[PDB]
Design a protein around this ligand. Sequence first.
Ligand SMILES: *C(=O)[C@@H]1CCC(=O)N1
Length: 41
Amino acid sequence: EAFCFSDRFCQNYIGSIPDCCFGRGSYSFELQPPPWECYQC
Ligand SMILES: *C(=O)[C@@H]1CCC(=O)N1
């Protein structure tokens, strides 16, 4: 599963959860990713 972040710019990682985006944050396939991997929710 992708790494999930609560904040838009993948600053706050909240673990990798099945729901992933509880809020409209971001997620990525790399914990603290490059700009292009910082996929917003
Ligand atoms: C998530 O994309 C992958 C698939 C299983 C796991 O633990 N990570």
